[PDB]
Amino acid sequence: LSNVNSDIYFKLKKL
Amino acid sequence: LTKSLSIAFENGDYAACEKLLPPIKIELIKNNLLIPDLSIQNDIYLNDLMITKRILEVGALASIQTFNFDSFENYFNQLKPYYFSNNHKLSESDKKSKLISLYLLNLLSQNNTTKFHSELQYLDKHIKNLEDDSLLSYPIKLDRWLMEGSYQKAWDLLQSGSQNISEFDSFTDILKSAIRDEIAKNTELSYDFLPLSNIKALLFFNNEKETEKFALERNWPIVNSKVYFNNQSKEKADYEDEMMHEEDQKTNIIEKAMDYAISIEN
Amino acid sequence: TKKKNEEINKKSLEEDDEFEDFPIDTDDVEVDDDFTNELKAELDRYKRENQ
Amino acid sequence: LHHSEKKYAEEDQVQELLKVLNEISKTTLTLDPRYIWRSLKDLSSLRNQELLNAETLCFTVNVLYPDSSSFKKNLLKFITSNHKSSVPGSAELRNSYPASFYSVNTEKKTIEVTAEINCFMHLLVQLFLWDSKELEQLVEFNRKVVIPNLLCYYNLRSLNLINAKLWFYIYLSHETLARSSEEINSDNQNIILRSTMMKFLKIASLKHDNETKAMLINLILRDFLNNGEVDSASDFISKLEYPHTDVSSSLEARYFFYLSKINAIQLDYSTANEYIIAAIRKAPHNSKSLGFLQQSNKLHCCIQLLMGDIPELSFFHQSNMQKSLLPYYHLTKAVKLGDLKKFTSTITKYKQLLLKDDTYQLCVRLRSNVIKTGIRIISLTYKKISLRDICLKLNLDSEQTVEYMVSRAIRDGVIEAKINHEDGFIETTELLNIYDSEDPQQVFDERIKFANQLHDEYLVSMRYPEDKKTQQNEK
Amino acid sequence: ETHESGIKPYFEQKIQETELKIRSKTENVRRLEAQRNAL
Amino acid sequence: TTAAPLLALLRENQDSVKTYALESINNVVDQLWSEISNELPDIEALYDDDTFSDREMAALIASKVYYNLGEYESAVKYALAAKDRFDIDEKSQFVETIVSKSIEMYVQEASKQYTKDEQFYTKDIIDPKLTSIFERMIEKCLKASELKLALGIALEGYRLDIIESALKSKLDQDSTSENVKIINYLLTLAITTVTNSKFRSSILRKSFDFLMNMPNCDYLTLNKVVVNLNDAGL
Structure with missing residues (x-):
């Protein structure tokens, strides 16, 4: 579950 | 140490028991840590238990004689789960029936019907026939009568409790003042005037001194031997009207319409 | 059958079926008063003649 | 005779399991899988009666088994060990397909499927225990297993919907055995039963999973009526974390x-x-x-x-x-x-x-x-x-x-x-007459709000099926 | 794996919150869209 | 069984007994909390008093109980009200919840005061305690050995120092290509997240020099910096 955590910072902030 | 406290109560010289009680409260930490509060039953803990309880019980009885209600509730509070958990290994006491009765009595003197019921339900299962009902009975009979609203009946038993005294006296006195307050509140709605003799009879005043004292505290003058509830009732309405909560509690005509209009225009 | 799990769980907590324990285990509010009344009205008249 | 019936019985189950499995792993539609899972259990409970019920045993042999094999063994041992084809790997009806479990690759850790199969296996087990009345030893052991197994996993919303049925079973079996006749060991475990469903109320509240929250709240309140602390119930009930959003x-x-x-x-x-x-x-x-x-x-x-x-x-x-x-x-x-x-x-x-x-x-x-x-x-x-x-x-x-x-x-x-x-x-x-009085204005006020509430309810809801139907392909 | 199971409630809060917002937005905008078209 | 003993041990008089209940509550605070919320205001009063050297401990305990009730907001505020034992909470796995709340609060305030002065971290309003919670988070990120985590939280709070440290640590040259990728993800994400001119300027200038130092980096990534800030000096 290390993978999901990274996405919050990168992708989803922009969205 | 511990056995010194137990016997100091039973000695009848309580001065020594009182002054020694806070040092043993340091030691009560040590005793509580021996037991796991009966989360796992062991006969190592059976021996420790006897002596833990021993301190709480003698002290719980002591709080009543020194009028320290706070402390009585606390000692009993600790005690409760030790009796509740588990198929018998003591887990009962001679002191248990007594201490439970005084607690119940205390809740009635607060004039809380609900809280009395709440406490009862905690005990209920474990007193049904295991401890039966014979001394525990005194506060149950008293609640019952007051619930009914037969105050005559309640009052008689209070008096007769002092012929079956078991430290009942300490809660007797409180619960007598309670009786008078309750009736006084009721009788406002009934009429405005009571002959001096009727106030004394109804509220169970024993002297006319008690009567005229109580009337002053209720903001009723006594002019020509006649009370005069007329005064305080109007005055209370006046004071109540000054508060801030309030606009929505009465609900203005302007207010009612406005709510419905935006209900529609949402 | 979707409800069925929730319903089975719930019935246990209610106490089996007390509905079926019960037969194993063991002015409609009170009686018509007109019979008595007959007796009363007649006796009124008896008194009434002599009053 | 006996084998054929168990096999056919196992097959029936295998069909149902596959439907619900595919369903969870293909897009997110959570509510539909959950309803399916409810029916699957009932179907299986009515099934067991016939074609023998050691179909569970069969499936255990023929899945990836981490500690489910030894648990199953534990189960037969209570009710006296009866072995007859109960050794793991003495059936392989997966056959290492990519259509029905790839036996090698799961062992290797390139693909993972023990997750869901495990959660389901405990669910099957509990259903069988309660039907029979295989209580005693199995209850404590069950409670022991499921808690580190479900907390091992990084909890989904999906997973939470399955375990809210497991939590009920833990509570029930312990209680039923208790009212039969008291034991000391039964009160030691009582303390532990209260503490676990209570701690979990916080976990379920962060996840905001509605099924789990509802369930835990009922159990905790029942517990308080059993022991007679009305007071504890008061503090608990001031806060209302009871969802009414989607629960049964x-x-x-x-x-x-x-x-x-x-x-x-x-x-x-x-x-x-x-x-x-x-x-x-x-x-x-x-x-x-x-x-x-x-x-x-x-x-x-x-x-x-x-x-x-x-x-x-x-x-x-x-x-x-x-x-x-x-x-x-x-x-x-x-x-x-x-x-x-x-x-x-x-x-x-x-x-x-x-x-x-x-x-x-x-x-x-x-x-x-x-x-x-x-x-x-x-x-x-x-x-x-x-x-x-x-x-x-x-x-x-x-x-x-x-x-x-x-x-x-x-x-x-x-x-x-x-x-x-x-x-x-x-x-x-x-x-x-109270019409003459000002009584009716208060009556009205409430009722209007009730009407108003239904209108909004109609309106949000009406749209719900419509959104689905538009997006799907039509002729 | 074990470490990340423990540290998760920091991360999990923020992403699950955000997702809920998408679900309610889509719902609302398309309901109002139908009303506007009819009128 | 019950918590009823514990509640009583607080209210009973003499220091020693009060001090003793605090430790007792702490043991079962996650397990059992229903009955202990009854006496939540009392726990708070013991913290106020200075006689206990376990006041810090008294504030710590109340904060766990709030979190458990369901009140995450009530929890963090109490914890920060005392300004005692947040260090324990930061590195505790089960409650990283109230920690999230503290982080979410700090980044907003930090952003505001960045416009005013680039360093404001030791300013009276931005309590040094807040700065300490934040750096503890950054260390947690690198312990899980993801540096995206550490970058993204710090860009939100308009922290110049923490970002500079991150870019500098990637001068190890673990591998050159692999260093460039991480850097590129932040320059695209700056465009969208950052709208504040002052903060935006500062961060691009730092990034130029760290890239510039490697003579081995692509100049596509260096171009991208020159154009965004649109500086004649760069």
Whole structure:
């Protein structure tokens, strides 16, 4: 579950 | 140490028991840590238990004689789960029936019907026939009568409790003042005037001194031997009207319409 | 059958079926008063003649 | 003979399992998989009866087994070890397909499927235990296994919907064994049962998973009624974290049943009467709700008698629930008349029946209500009545004793009168026409809001199916 | 794996919150869209 | 069984007994909390008093109980009200919840005061305690050995120092290509997240020099910096 955590910072902030 | 406290109560010289009680409260930490509060039953803990309880019980009885209600509730509070958990290994006491009765009595003197019921339900299962009902009975009979609203009946038993005294006296006195307050509140709605003799009879005043004292505290003058509830009732309405909560509690005509209009225009 | 799990769980907590324990285990509010009344009205008249 | 039946039985299960498995792993539609999982269990429970039930054992041999093999062994060992094809790998009906479990690759850790199969395997196990009554050893061991297995996993929303059924089972099996006959070891484990569902209430609240939250709340409140701490329930119930968002109407009905009981003894019938009626409507009306239907009727009789209301005579007569409502019927009459003598005889004679459902606790308190209700009806009939006349009728000792039980009663405005002792009669306090008064404005205000609420409800909901239908391909 | 199971409630809060917002937005905008078209 | 003993041990008089209950509550605070919320205001009063050297401990315990009730907001505020034992909470796995709340609060305030002065971290309003909670988070990120985590939280709070440290640590040259990728993800994400001119300027200038130092980096990534800030000096 290390993978999901990274996405919050990168992708989803922009969205 | 511990056995010194137990016997100091039973000695009848309580001065020594009182002054020694806070040092043993340091030691009560040590005793509580021996037991796991009966989360796992062991006969190592059976021996420790006897002596833990021993301190709480003698002290719980002591709080009543020194009028320290706070402390009585606390000692009993600790005690409760030790009796509740588990198929018998003591887990009962001679002191248990007594201490439970005084607690119940205390809740009635607060004039809380609900809280009395709440406490009862905690005990209920474990007193049904295991401890039966014979001394525990005194506060149950008293609640019952007051619930009914037969105050005559309640009052008689209070008096007769002092012929079956078991430290009942300490809660007797409180619960007598309670009786008078309750009736006084009721009788406002009934009429405005009571002959001096009727106030004394109804509220169970024993002297006319008690009567005229109580009337002053209720903001009723006594002019020509006649009370005069007329005064305080109007005055209370006046004071109540000054508060801030309030606009929505009465609900203005302007207010009612406005709510419905935006209900529609949402 | 979707409800069925929730319903089975719930019935246990209610106490089996007390509905079926019960037969194993063991002015409609009170009686018509007109019979008595007959007796009363007649006796009124008896008194009434002599009053 | 025996093998063929188990195999066919196993096959039937394998079909169902595959449907629900595919479903979870193909897009997110959570609500649909959850409904499927509910039916799958029932289907399997009706199934077991026939074609033998050691189909579970078969599937255990033919899945990836981390500690499910040894658990299954544990299960047969309780009920005496019966082996007959129970050694792992003595069936391979997966056959290492990419269509029905790739036996090598899962072992290797390139693909993972032990997740869900494990969660399902415990669910099957619990269902079998409760049906049979394989309690004792298996219960403690089960509780032990499932908690580090489900907390091993990084909890989904999906996973949470399955485990809210496991949590119920843990609670049930421990309780049922307990009422059979007490043990010391049973109370040690009680402390631990309270602590685990209670800690989990916080976990479920962060995840905001509705099924889990609802479930935990019911169990914790039941627990408090068992041990008699009304006080603990008060602090718990001030905060309402009970979702009503999407949960089964059956849970909603169960929740309201707790609330009624607690409030009633805290001397409130305003809320109690609303919740037990509300619960009947929420509750299904199948032949699987006979338990629930019956007991709601029983608590409501009490609530009304406590307030001072007389329930319909018609309610008990026209019921098919009259057989049971025999104590309740008798109470209603006794109370009505204000006859004290009948009441004592009723309550003593029916002690055992009332005590089962703990309505006996409520019935001691109906002593106040016998006397008071007979006087509600007497004030209604006779407007101005001497205390002398009251005393003779209802057997009450003297004019001074009746005045005290009445004085209290009118404060609360039950009877609605005012006493005149300086003349000597009691005179009912009329309100007569209330249209003339300002009463109707308050009635209206509420109702309007109820109408308003349904309109908004219609509108959000109406859209829901429409959004689905548009997006799907059509001719 | 074990470490990340423990540290998760920091991360999990923020992403699950955000997702809920998408679900309610889509719902609302398309409901109002139908109303506007009819009028 | 119950918590009832524990509640009583607080209220009973003499210092020693009060001090003893605090430790007792702490043991079962996650397990059992229903009955202990009854006496939530009392726990708070013991913290106020200075006689206990376990006041810090008293504030710590109340904060766990709030979190458990369901009140995450009530929890963090109490914890920060005392300004005692947040260090324990930061590195505790079960409650990283109230920590999230503290982080969410700090980044907003930090952003505001960045416009005013680039360093404001030791300013009276931005309590040094807040700065300490934040750096503890950054260390947690690198312990899980993801540096995206550490970058993204710090860009939100307009922290110049923490970002500079991150870019500098990637001068190890673990591998050159692999260093460039991480850097590129932040320059695209700056465009969208950052709208504040002052903060935006500062961060691009730092990034130029760290890239510039490697003579081995692509000049596509260096171009991208020159154009965004649009500086004649760069």
